[PDB]
Design a protein around this motif. Structure first.
Motif, mmCIF file in Angstrom:
data_model
loop_
_atom_site.group_PDB
_atom_site.id
_atom_site.type_symbol
_atom_site.label_atom_id
_atom_site.label_comp_id
_atom_site.label_asym_id
_atom_site.label_seq_id
_atom_site.Cartn_x
_atom_site.Cartn_y
_atom_site.Cartn_z
ATOM 1 N N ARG A 1 -15.896 -0.039 -1.294
ATOM 2 C CA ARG A 1 -16.268 1.149 -2.234
ATOM 3 C C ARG A 1 -17.431 1.055 -2.949
ATOM 4 O O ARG A 1 -17.895 2.269 -3.490
ATOM 5 C CB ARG A 1 -14.848 0.846 -3.012
ATOM 6 N N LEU B 1 -22.764 0.452 -13.615
ATOM 7 C CA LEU B 1 -22.937 -0.421 -14.835
ATOM 8 C C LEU B 1 -21.917 -1.605 -14.463
ATOM 9 O O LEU B 1 -22.137 -2.483 -15.342
ATOM 10 C CB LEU B 1 -22.477 0.581 -15.889
ATOM 11 N N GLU C 1 -8.849 1.193 -12.021
ATOM 12 C CA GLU C 1 -9.378 1.792 -10.840
ATOM 13 C C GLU C 1 -8.131 1.431 -9.781
ATOM 14 O O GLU C 1 -7.281 0.572 -9.999
ATOM 15 C CB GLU C 1 -10.591 1.187 -10.197
ATOM 16 N N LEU C 2 -8.170 2.252 -8.850
ATOM 17 C CA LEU C 2 -6.756 2.134 -7.713
ATOM 18 C C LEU C 2 -7.528 1.709 -6.385
ATOM 19 O O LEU C 2 -8.552 2.309 -6.026
ATOM 20 C CB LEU C 2 -6.300 3.587 -7.585
ATOM 21 N N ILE C 3 -6.468 0.995 -5.699
ATOM 22 C CA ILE C 3 -6.780 0.994 -4.203
ATOM 23 C C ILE C 3 -5.224 0.971 -3.637
ATOM 24 O O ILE C 3 -4.533 0.432 -4.119
ATOM 25 C CB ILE C 3 -7.314 -0.552 -3.783
ATOM 26 N N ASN D 1 -3.223 0.698 0.116
ATOM 27 C CA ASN D 1 -3.387 0.073 1.752
ATOM 28 C C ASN D 1 -2.318 -0.093 2.494
ATOM 29 O O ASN D 1 -1.211 -0.227 1.964
ATOM 30 C CB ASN D 1 -4.019 -1.383 1.596
ATOM 31 N N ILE E 1 -15.366 2.612 -15.614
ATOM 32 C CA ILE E 1 -15.805 1.630 -14.840
ATOM 33 C C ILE E 1 -16.379 0.526 -15.724
ATOM 34 O O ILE E 1 -16.473 -0.760 -14.823
ATOM 35 C CB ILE E 1 -16.828 1.984 -13.675
ATOM 36 N N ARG F 1 -14.326 -2.791 -15.138
ATOM 37 C CA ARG F 1 -13.959 -3.187 -13.937
ATOM 38 C C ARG F 1 -12.407 -3.601 -13.623
ATOM 39 O O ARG F 1 -12.438 -5.071 -13.130
ATOM 40 C CB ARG F 1 -15.107 -4.275 -13.444
ATOM 41 N N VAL G 1 -9.056 -3.263 -11.305
ATOM 42 C CA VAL G 1 -8.485 -2.793 -10.199
ATOM 43 C C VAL G 1 -7.149 -2.928 -10.082
ATOM 44 O O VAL G 1 -6.537 -4.333 -10.396
ATOM 45 C CB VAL G 1 -9.413 -3.512 -8.948
ATOM 46 N N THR H 1 -3.579 -2.500 -7.530
ATOM 47 C CA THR H 1 -3.550 -2.625 -6.063
ATOM 48 C C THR H 1 -1.967 -2.265 -5.765
ATOM 49 O O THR H 1 -1.101 -2.493 -6.365
ATOM 50 C CB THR H 1 -3.729 -3.918 -5.433
ATOM 51 N N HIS I 1 -0.190 -2.708 -2.567
ATOM 52 C CA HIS I 1 -0.461 -3.153 -0.909
ATOM 53 C C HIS I 1 0.987 -3.177 -0.274
ATOM 54 O O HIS I 1 1.623 -3.824 -0.484
ATOM 55 C CB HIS I 1 -1.002 -4.411 -0.952
ATOM 56 N N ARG J 1 -0.253 -5.738 -7.547
ATOM 57 C CA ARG J 1 -1.529 -6.774 -8.249
ATOM 58 C C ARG J 1 -2.339 -6.065 -8.937
ATOM 59 O O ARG J 1 -3.234 -5.412 -8.097
ATOM 60 C CB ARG J 1 -1.592 -7.817 -7.080
ATOM 61 N N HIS K 1 -5.942 -6.592 -10.838
ATOM 62 C CA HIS K 1 -6.914 -7.656 -11.070
ATOM 63 C C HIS K 1 -8.266 -6.982 -11.744
ATOM 64 O O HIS K 1 -8.392 -6.086 -11.906
ATOM 65 C CB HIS K 1 -7.458 -7.908 -9.555
#
Lengths: 125, 190, 225, 303, 123, 147, 69
Positions: free
Chosen positions: B166, B177, D194-196, D198, D222, D225, D227, D229, D231, D240, D242
């Motif tokens: 990503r 940043l 933020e997203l993921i 899978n 951002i 930072r 994230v 999940t 999954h 999860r 993180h």
RNA sequence: AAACUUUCAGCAACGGAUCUCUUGGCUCUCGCAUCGAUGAAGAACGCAGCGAAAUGCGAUACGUAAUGUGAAUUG
RNA sequence: GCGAAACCACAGCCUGGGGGGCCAGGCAAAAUCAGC
RNA sequence: UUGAGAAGCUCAGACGAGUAGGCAGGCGUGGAGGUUUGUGACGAAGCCUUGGGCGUGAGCCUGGGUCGAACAGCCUCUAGUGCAGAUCUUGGUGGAAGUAGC
RNA sequence: AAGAGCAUAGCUGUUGGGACCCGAAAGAUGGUGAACCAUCUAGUAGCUGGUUC
RNA sequence: UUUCAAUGGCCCGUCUAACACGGACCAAGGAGUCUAGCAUCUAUGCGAGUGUUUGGGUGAUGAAAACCCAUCCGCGA
RNA sequence: AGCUAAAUAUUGGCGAGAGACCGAUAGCGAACAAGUAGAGUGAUCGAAAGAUGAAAAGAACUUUGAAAAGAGAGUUAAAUAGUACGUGAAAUUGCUGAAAGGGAAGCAUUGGAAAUCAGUCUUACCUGGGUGAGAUCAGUAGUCUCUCGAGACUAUGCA
């Protein structure tokens, strides 16, 4: 109830004469019910199981799979049908033991012996 | 024929008795109080009067000596009206000159059967959760296949495998940043 | 009994081995036996000593239930299930059919695996197919009127066994037991017993006019504190 | 063999030959591969270890990454469009609870709200039903609506509806962990995460996974930072959250591999029922019901 | 009447805390050598009829309703006239389906089922 | 196999074990509770000094007649010794402790020994069971500024 | 249990099974043929003899005879 | 403070109780009368395709003939 | 490096008073080894 | 006013250590007849529990985990029916100890 | 001095048997080898320990 | 529940104040049972009587069960 | 000087049917390889030891390691069933978490601190009018089972 002093009702005596019967008694204990289309043309409720019969499986997890009997395994009390095969890890296939009481016979392997058993035991050809 | 059928069934053995610890209960369907008392047992007491519902509408069941030997026709029946003051006035006019103890029971088992229909009707009209059964065979299977499927994803590893992808694809502005000053140049080298 | 050939050590013998000349049978005078079948047949004519004994006869048309003589020539068991449904006795047979359960414990390692209940008892006179017709319905026991057994008229010790009588065997109930002052014809020197209380109901003399005229003025119930 | 002493001596000696010739099969193989590493290759290209993900049942609804139009014609015009189209509707969550919930259900109902900004908390009071909640919550600018449903002071299930007519999903939470219980936890901040997502090969995989894209803000900060999940793996939806930091790691080929530190929660869901329309457990039409007997095959997956 | 207990700590057989062969259920000591039998002060107490509880508030849960094992759906029916003096305790071996039908009917009779929540997760 | 430790996640950890090891039980334990909680590669440099009598391992619990050494005071313990057979067995295990992350593809230079366990065995001496947990050190990300 | 009878059970040769014991089959009549006709096989001896006209004993019987009616 | 000891709890070991079974025992009952110089009971040795505290068998050796059933054996 | 066994109510400081424990006192710091 | 299991209900007083001993009521275990339109693969028995409940007590009921085929309440019948101990029997495991020692 | 007994069951007791459990040198009979081995024997208590809600 | 505080608390059984004797711990086993005779008390059945089961008869549905009973006989009168 | 059936005995021999018997330390010494293994020169003495799973599907393949095995994996509904195999108690051992410990703990009583658990409290209750539904209502018509009317009904109105 039973009214004979020459039959046994104890689980001990009956469950010993089953599991230690010889391989001629172990034949008529492995019999299969006939299909409803054969039950009326042979007038026979059940036949002892031969090799190379034409059966369908009614119970179990292998429901409805049709085949022919490959090796009637009289020792461990189970038939062995064509192409109904649980896999093995190594890559080979294993045969699945289907009980001889679960299958339904759809076409007999008619011979001179069976016919001479069919024509007397309540029916005809 | 009454103390005979109480010194047999009240003290030796009756198939309806339930040995409670502070009481004893009667499993008969024509008991007016639920307990296996002398003045309550429907077998010894040979003139009786009970109230018991049947499919929405409450009934009154009565017996006599002169029908005791006819177990099919033993109990007659009267259907009790919806109006609660009408039903009390209909128990009395049918149970006249019966002892005051027995008519006391029927009126108390009318108060107790009306409160059951006046509650189970409101209870049926509310919206209440679904009591669904748990199953030990299918909660020991989940717990078994969970940890076999939790460690079979490398949960942390596949997060970071795409997290840099990503980054490295550049979904963020060229110099973002969330990154320090040094290792982004390695992405520039990448 | 264990074989005849220290009970604290393992491999040792058991303390005071059981022995085959234990008293297994027991004598009872014939006039107390003849008293029990007399009493346990009378219980079979009481419609309320049958319910408490655990019978679902709550639809039966009469007690004692006397079916006709033609029931002694019923041949097939579908002519007995026929009878037990017209007279609403079949709810007892369903109580026996619905209620076989595997025996709790090591009875089942010992040739008894299935406990169940006791349905009606059919007492016949002449065995003209009535035994073979009914003997494959659950629960139903069949006995001749003359050789009546106590283990079937009061199973478990609880009186009130549901008896379905046959007319030809209901008549022979006055020559097997006779009367209270007349000798039973099928028994030498049998007279039916009598009672220590002449009226079988003691809370209905106390309330009679013979007693409540003479009694002294009553006190109250549970007294005030 | 009816004996026990014979049966585990006849097997001990039988195993010690099967444990011998396997070495005799691999010792003779050991000398030719260092002479010829080309036979080493074929075998490696031949006998790759087989695993459950590779021995799945063949389900034909595994959507390939090739963009076929009938897919994107459907899901560009569904009710999830506002959270996927140019409008970019920031979804406003409503998290209610089961009736008469307890204390141990409420400290988990703050950990999900840590994950979800643009998400209120409104404890369910008294006599109100989910179908009446959804119509009463859409009129005040709300998008989705979660319901934490505890029982006996443990949270076991979670349903989220989609307003006012969207598909309603009934998961069940499992393997529940709080944020205190995890070793080496961290503080969360106000940054939108933020997203993921899978491994959602099935088409129904890309119906749930969009309803999980529908709870998060469509463009996150951002600076945090952070994230989150979702999954799927053997039909379990692992959750999860993180917080990452990129650092050099020589093993993975790019050289730059981040290091994760979990925040909490740590829960894990199944999928039981899916209803198009607001969730009524008895007056609803079932988009997908979980068959608790056709999941016996560990090689059959529906997510 | 408010329920009361004359004792709350059960009785615990002497030296059944030290030795693991000796169980904690009470057994009256049999030796006159004993310190406990002669009832020396400082040693543990004994079960006597003095600690018997009130003959009306006996067998009662702290709420006030006595217990009652209901092992099927027609065992809660008898509690129709006794819903303010009995609590329908369901028996332990009852299946997790036959259980969910006692609850839905005992609730109509206003009877307190003490452990209706077992095996029953609600949705 | 079902292990005794809450750690050893799939993420940054790996495990090995050794069963029916024909050594003493009261001798590998004091080794095990010394190597516990340490980094992996240091433990290798640690135990090879035991193999050349360069460092002795303290005997805390089963301290029967263990003579005092000069180097047992590095940890404060009075008594220590140099067992060689038990630490030969641990080297065999820790090779599998490496070679399991070498197949899982971890980061090898942040690898600590998380949980070492020593149990008994069905007596034939006093044999042993051993299981080991090696894990990465669970690093910490710096917090984002403010909100 | 016995040395003789441990032998056959541990073997694989079937026991000499001889079913030869059922009661209630009272021995059929030979010797005479007329009495073979009027005999009914279920009814006991003294109920056949004193039905078709004859005695089982010309002396006294040492028991109470059956009375059915 | 760490260690050590003790205590509590969780996990892993040890260990084989409890529970459930049961081709075994034990007891009672019923029918029957049948070993040997025409070589008995017992012993040794051998014999199996691959057999190893077991079975069957006698160099026609894990048995042939005759009858009956009817297509198996099995690792 | 291999490796027991005897033995095992629980135990372990002294003075005085009715013994290791009771009463009143002196006091009381981990963990160990060699003479004794 | 219903409190008639007259083997129930109710009112009032006094009393309460206990050895040898005497009497009475109950608790629990394996099997047997009867009974619960009895419980059970939606999980019986068992087992474990820093969970709750009852009884003065022997004991019983129950929630959670484990587990996998049977089992219990009531009235009677029956006994190979209750353990802390016998330098007790068999099995298992400890401290002495990695000491004595080779 | 106008008969009260007979039968069955239960409880407690008492004697007799292995006689609540375990322990207490003996002798006999028949054998094995140059003392030992089985069997009667479940030899012997006035007694020593133990004797289960 | 774990632990703290205050106060109390001589190790259990067998013995005859202490002792001695038994006790390393855990599990399963393990001790007034069966039979005959006599006597007491109670229960039941019959009563100047009482007792079917040595046997006989009977019992098609465990037919060793249940049921019926002749001629003696025992105890009593 | 001699013979002779039947009634009678039968822990053995060839079979058979049972059982208020024992349920793997029990019941035969022996449920399994049992008078076997083993001990004694010999007569003789003489054990321990049952249960994977429904089906072996008894773990392919990759990798570390000389080996044993271990780890990834994989079969199973269950591996919390891997032949050290059904359930798996106690003693007893190691690790982890929390405590306590100045030449004694142990327990009992009353409470502090920490942890944690339960309690129906969820809501229910009760009171008028209006609107609609009908039934046990009809200045109403029919069927059946019982005994004039008592229930079950089917209509039609719902006064």
């Amino acid at each position: 109830m039973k009214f004979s002093r020459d039959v046994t009702s104890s689980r001990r005596k009956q469950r010993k004469a089953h599991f230690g019967a010889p391989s001629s008694v172990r034949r008529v204990l492995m019999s299969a019910p006939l299909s409803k289309e054969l039950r009326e043309q042979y007038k026979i409720r059940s036949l002892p199981v031969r090799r190379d019969d034409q059966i369908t499986v009614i119970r179990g997890s292998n429901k409805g799979r049709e085949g022919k009997i490959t090796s009637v395994y009289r020792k461990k009390f189970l038939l062995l049908i064509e192409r109904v095969t649980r896999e093995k890890a190594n890559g080979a296939s294993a045969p699945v033991g289907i009980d001889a009481s679960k299958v339904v016979i759809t076409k007999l392997h008619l011979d001179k012996d069976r016919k001479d058993l069919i024509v007397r035991k309540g029916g005809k050809v | 024929q009454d103390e005979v059928i109480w010194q047999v069934v009240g003290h030796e053995f009756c198939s309806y008795r339930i040995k409670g610890e502070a009481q004893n209960f009667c499993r008969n369907e024509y008991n007016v109080t639920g307990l296996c008392n002398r003045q309550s047992c429907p077998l010894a007491n040979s003139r009786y009067a009970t109230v018991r519902e049947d499919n929405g509408k409450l009934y009154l069941y009565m017996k006599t000596i002169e029908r005791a030997h006819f177990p099919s026709k033993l109990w007659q029946r009267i259907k009790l009206s919806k109006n609660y003051a009408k039903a009390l006035e209909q128990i009395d006019q049918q149970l006249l000159y019966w002892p005051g103890r027995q008519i006391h029971r029927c009126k108390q088992r009318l108060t107790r059967l009306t409160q059951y229909l006046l509650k189970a009707r409101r209870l049926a009209l509310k919206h209440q959760p679904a009591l669904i059964p748990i199953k030990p065979k299918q909660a020991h299977r989940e717990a078994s296949r969970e940890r076999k499927a939790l460690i079979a994803a490398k949960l942390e590893k596949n997060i970071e495998k795409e997290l840099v992808k990503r980054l490295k694809s550049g979904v963020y502005g060229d110099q973002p940043l969330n990154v320090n000053e040094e290792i982004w140049n390695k992405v520039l080298a990448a | 009994a264990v074989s005849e050939k220290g009970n604290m050590c393992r491999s040792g013998r058991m303390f005071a081995p059981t022995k085959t000349w234990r008293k297994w049978h027991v004598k009872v005078n014939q006039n107390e036996k003849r008293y029990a079948i007399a009493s346990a047949v009378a219980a079979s004519g009481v419609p309320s000593l049958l319910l408490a004994r655990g019978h679902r006869i709550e639809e039966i048309p009469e007690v004692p239930l006397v079916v006709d003589d033609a029931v002694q020539s019923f041949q097939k068991t579908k002519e007995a299930v026929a009878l037990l449904k017209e007279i609403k006795a079949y709810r007892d047979v369903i109580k026996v059919a619905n209620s076989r359960k595997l025996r709790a414990g090591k009875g089942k390692l010992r040739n008894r695996r299935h406990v169940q209940r006791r349905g009606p008892l059919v007492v016949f006179n002449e065995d003209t197919g009535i035994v073979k017709a009914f003997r494959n319905i659950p629960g139903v026991e069949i006995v001749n009127v003359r050789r009546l057994n106590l283990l079937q008229l009061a199973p478990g010790g609880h009186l009130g066994r549901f008896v379905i009588w046959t007319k030809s065997a209901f008549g022979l109930l006055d020559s097997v037991f006779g009367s209270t002052t007349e000798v039973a014809q099928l028994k030498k020197n049998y007279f039916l017993p009598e009672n220590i209380i002449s009226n079988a109901d003691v809370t209905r003399l106390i309330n009679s006019d013979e007693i409540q005229s003479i009694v002294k003025a009553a006190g109250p119930s549970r007294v005030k504190r | 063999i009816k004996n026990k002493i014979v049966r585990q001596q006849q097997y001990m000696k039988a195993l010690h030959q099967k444990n011998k010739d396997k070495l005799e099969r691999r010792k003779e193989r050991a000398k030719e591969e260092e002479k010829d590493p080309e036979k080493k290759r074929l075998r490696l290209s031949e006998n790759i270890p087989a695993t459950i993900e590779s021995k799945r049942v063949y389900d034909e609804t595994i959507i390939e990454d090739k963009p076929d139009e009938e897919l994107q014609a459907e899901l560009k015009d569904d009710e999830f469009s506002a959270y996927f189209s140019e409008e970019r509707k920031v979804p406003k969550l409503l998290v209610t609870t089961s009736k008469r919930a307890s204390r141990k259900c409420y400290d988990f109902a703050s950990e999900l709200l840590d994950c979800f900004p643009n998400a209120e908390f409104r404890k369910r009071t008294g006599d109100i039903e989910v179908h009446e909640i959804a119509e009463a919550a859409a009129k005040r600018g709300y998008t989705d609506l979660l319901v934490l449903n505890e029982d006996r002071k443990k949270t076991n299930a979670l349903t989220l509806v989609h307003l006012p007519n969207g598909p309603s999903f009934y998961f069940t939470l499992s393997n529940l962990q709080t944020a205190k219980e995890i070793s080496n936890h961290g503080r969360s901040t106000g940054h939108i995460p933020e997203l993921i997502i899978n491994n959602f090969s099935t088409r129904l995989g890309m119906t749930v996974a969009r309803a999980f894209q529908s709870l998060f803000i469509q463009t996150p900060q951002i600076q945090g930072r952070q994230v989150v999940t979702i999954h799927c793996q053997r039909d379990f939806l692992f959750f999860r959250r993180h917080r990452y930091a990129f650092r050099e790691k020589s093993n993975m080929p790019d050289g730059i591999g981040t290091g994760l530190q979990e925040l909490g929660p740590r829960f894990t869901m199944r999928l039981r029922m899916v209803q198009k329309g607001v969730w009524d457990r008895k007056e609803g039409e079932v988009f997908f019901e979980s068959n608790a007997g056709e999941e016996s095959d560990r090689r059959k997956f529906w997510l | 009447v408010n329920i009361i207990k004359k004792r709350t700590k059960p009785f615990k057989r002497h030296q059944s805390d030290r030795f693991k062969r000796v169980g904690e259920s009470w057994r009256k000591p049999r030796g006159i050598d004993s310190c406990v039998r002669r009832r020396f002060r400082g040693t543990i107490s004994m079960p006597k009829i003095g600690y018997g509880n009130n003959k009306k508030t006996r067998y009662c849960m702290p709420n006030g309703l006595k217990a009652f094992l209901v092992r099927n759906v027609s065992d809660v029916e008898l509690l129709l006239m006794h819903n303010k003096t009995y609590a329908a305790e369901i028996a332990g071996n009852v299946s997790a389906r036959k259980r969910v039908e006692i609850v839905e009917k005992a609730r109509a009779l206003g009877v307190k089922v003490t452990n209706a929540g077992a095996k029953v997760r609600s949705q | 196999v079902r292990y005794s430790a809450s750690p050893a996640l799939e993420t940054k950890c790996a495990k090995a074990r050794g069963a029916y090891l024909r050594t003493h039980f009261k001798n590998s334990r004091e080794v095990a509770f010394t190597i516990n909680g340490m980094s992996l590669k240091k433990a290798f440099i640690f135990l090879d000094n035991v193999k050349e009598h360069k460092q002795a391992v303290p005997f805390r619990r089963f301290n029967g007649g263990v003579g005092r050494t000069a180097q047992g005071k590095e940890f404060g313990v009075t008594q220590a010794r140099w067992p060689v057979k038990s630490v030969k067995f641990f080297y065999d295990l820790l090779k599998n402790a490496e070679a399991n992350a070498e197949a899982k593809g971890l980061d090898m230079d942040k690898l600590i020994i998380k949980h070492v366990q020593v149990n008994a065995a069905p007596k034939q001496s006093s044999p042993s069971h051993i299981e080991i947990i090696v894990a990465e050190e669970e690093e910490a990300v710096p917090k984002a500024n403010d909100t | 249990a016995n040395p003789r009878q441990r032998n056959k059970q541990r073997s694989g040769k079937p026991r000499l099974t001889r079913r030869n014991a059922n009661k209630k089959a009272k021995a059929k009549i030979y010797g005479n043929f007329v009495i073979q006709q009027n005999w009914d096989k279920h009814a006991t001896l003294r109920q056949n003899y004193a039905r078709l006209g004859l005695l089982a004993t010309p002396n006294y019987v040492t028991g109470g005879v059956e009375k059915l009616y």
